[PDB]
């Protein structure tokens, strides 16, 4: 009927390969100038990123499916269990439904977070699908977004330490870094700034890892290595 | 030497037809029960659609290249220009940053519609990517959409005047509307409403249609007919 | 400046998901009308599977990254390692170049199988790609064809026994047929046709499966169990 | 049932946009080194030219809607009406249909055009599916492939003459031409020559047209230009 109704064979089929984990990543848009005008601390900012995990418990809460999540800096990655057929297993409504719900909760609980500071405009998030064969294609993907979280604070906060505390310029700052080593960002935190990395909080040195417990509960544990997932076999070891 | 970021091959290619239109549509997540709780005045609610009408403008302006959006009800849908390539196509970014920019600012200028009306929870978007290859086809797709807010206003007019006057049950009202005709549904809403049902307001009867003229302005015209693509001749006239 | 390349821009991406096993799977088409007028022998034509076979080796030497084919009725499935990249694991090139060196060998090699029959009209064959995210699933697909490889050839045995040497009807072997058992298939070769059913041909009963012992070597062998694959496992150890 | 049947849900729709121009373009695999070794005649060879068509004609009568085919040099291209749903317009079925028949052609019409070259071996083909959204598109993709032959042979005809009659090297035959300009290539072909480019078989310079007249009927003439078109309107005119 309607005679307009053709164009709905138009809508391609966008299925994601079956009994695969399906990962929805989002990432800020423009968030460095959206950290800059609600002067966000640097290097690490609590509100943001409570903000973010109160927004990923949301999204664990109102979609379904959705067995772990992980975050960090301006990230939130979410994992549907790979038997799900939630939707048809359609990538655009894993994606919209996990971003909308997101964008809409950062702003309805921002007060929670920044009582003070005021929020300028609404944000926007970057999304992404992506699928992952195997257990250990998932668990390195894991991997890979928590040791990134490790590499840029070790970065941003030798980075920042100077710039803030040893009046170093932006500019200068990066080329007293560029060649460092790890190790050597260690030392340099504990010489000149009496710091001790090992110390700084949990939540910016790992992340937020949120899970079943129920309700999805934050954790800033390593993920990396096989405690956290022997501990926490219901994850992997379910079904399809 | 990362060792984690062989992951990255796993990320599909989703580019959209090249030279033709993509749309990407939006549908309120599980509205019937939003519009309940939130007190949505039946069969139309200047707030809501008006709320809504604010979001799809916040989209155009924020994001790139969309040169036509058509909202009524619970939806909204975003025409980008078909010689776009804004992210090189990507349909998963299409989909996220309008989910997500739209979710955002239906939360944010919220009380700007609903300054009683207190909003009880944040709210999810479902989306969609679809592409029109031409001119006609995606003329035909706006006309579906206005037709399906005619079909469903006439139809939800008659139907809330029978309950919220008549004091018919819904379970009444609806087997009263079986088997009628859009004369027939006129012709009920005039005799026992006193209602003329072309006298609504245009909006609850055509929806809304946004345009540049610069900025995105609203129009509560006739999309399916001639006139208005005479009238604005620069947007399907436009290169590629 | 060519002025009509453009159109190069509509070609677009069907890469494999990465680190997957990707099969090829072959179907001669029409080819039951094939077999009427070519004379192939019933239930089993040696000739035919024979050919079948040899251009499987044909397109295991021609083409690359082919671990494994296995072959049986008017089919043939190819199985490409999972780190290849041959060519960007584009799909419709795995399809094609499988597709056509199949084709082409089938006509250049008839005369060696069938020296006395001519090969009245060059065929067509039916083509199609799958990827199979891991060991297991790979597996799974390849017993499903073995087995779909035993529930046909026993149920044909049993039915051109009927017709060949009972002189049944073709439609009172089916009605003999329906509803019968694995079990009673056995019994009414055994007892009517003084058939041992284990006892036919290995090819006709099992298919051929084709690897790398270097050149390609059939075997009739069984691959579901665990046997096979414990005695050849570089194929599915091999790395990625 | 089977156990093993779950493999199928591991297939993927690889559906062609609907009510747009599907072509099939198939290009001879490593076809410098096929022409070597049977001895092609450079910079043409009616033969291999004809062969070509021959298993066009073949692929245009075996499978189906194809309605406009055209070739040149080691491809051939094949338009499949918009309206078709032949195989629920699956990409793979266009790509394994049309590959797979060329190829056994090509071997089995062989020596109806080399009769005393022998086939040395099956050869292969590369293969691809591209959807074009509009009439004009379609044109524009014929008329890139037309204009190529063109660019090709005035090249190639002078390349080899430059080698087969002015006795110069491959490398110095290509010094001499980088830079020339297509009034040049004239100007050498008819000076240095003697050879009138215009009157080169059309064959040569405009490539082969396959449409139906009912059958298949090869045409060497312009399609680049209106006057083809407004002559077999029935092609691009018919519906959807």
């Known amino acids: 009927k ?5 164009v709905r064979d138009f809508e391609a089929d966008d299925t994601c390969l079956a009994h695969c984990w399906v990962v929805v990543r989002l990432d800020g848009r423009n968030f460095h100038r959206f950290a800059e005008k609600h002067n966000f601390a640097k290097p690490n900012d609590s509100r943001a990123l409570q903000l973010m995990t109160k927004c990923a418990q949301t999204v664990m809460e109102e979609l379904e499916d959705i067995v772990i999540a992980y975050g960090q800096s301006d990230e939130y990655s979410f994992v549907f269990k ?5 939707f048809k297993r359609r990538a ?4 919209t439904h996990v971003a909308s719900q997101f964008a809409s909760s950062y702003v309805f609980y921002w007060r929670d977070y920044f009582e003070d500071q005021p929020l300028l405009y609404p944000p926007g998030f970057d999304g992404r699908v992506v699928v992952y064969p195997s257990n ?14 490790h ?18 310029t932006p500019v200068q700052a990066q080329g007293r870094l ?5 190790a050597d960002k260690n030392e340099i935190l504990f010489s000149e700034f ?4 090992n110390n700084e ?10 899970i079943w417990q129920t309700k999805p509960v934050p954790l800033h544990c390593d993920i990396i290595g096989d405690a956290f997932w022997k501990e926490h076999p219901e994850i992997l070891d379910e079904d399809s």
Chains 1, 2, 3, 4 share one sequence.
């Open 2 to 6: 309607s005679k307009f109704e053709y």
């Open 82 to 86: 790979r038997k799900t057929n939630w």
């Open 92 to 95: 655009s409504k894993f994606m």
């Open 136 to 149: 250990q294609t998932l668990k390195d993907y894991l991997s890979w977004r928590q040791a990134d979280c």
């Open 151 to 168: 590499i840029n604070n070790l970065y941003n906060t030798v980075f920042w330490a100077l710039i803030q505390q040893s009046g170093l």
């Open 178 to 182: 560029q060649g460092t080593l790890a």
């Open 194 to 197: 009496n710091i001790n990395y």
């Open 201 to 210: 909080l949990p939540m910016y040195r790992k992340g937020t890892v949120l």
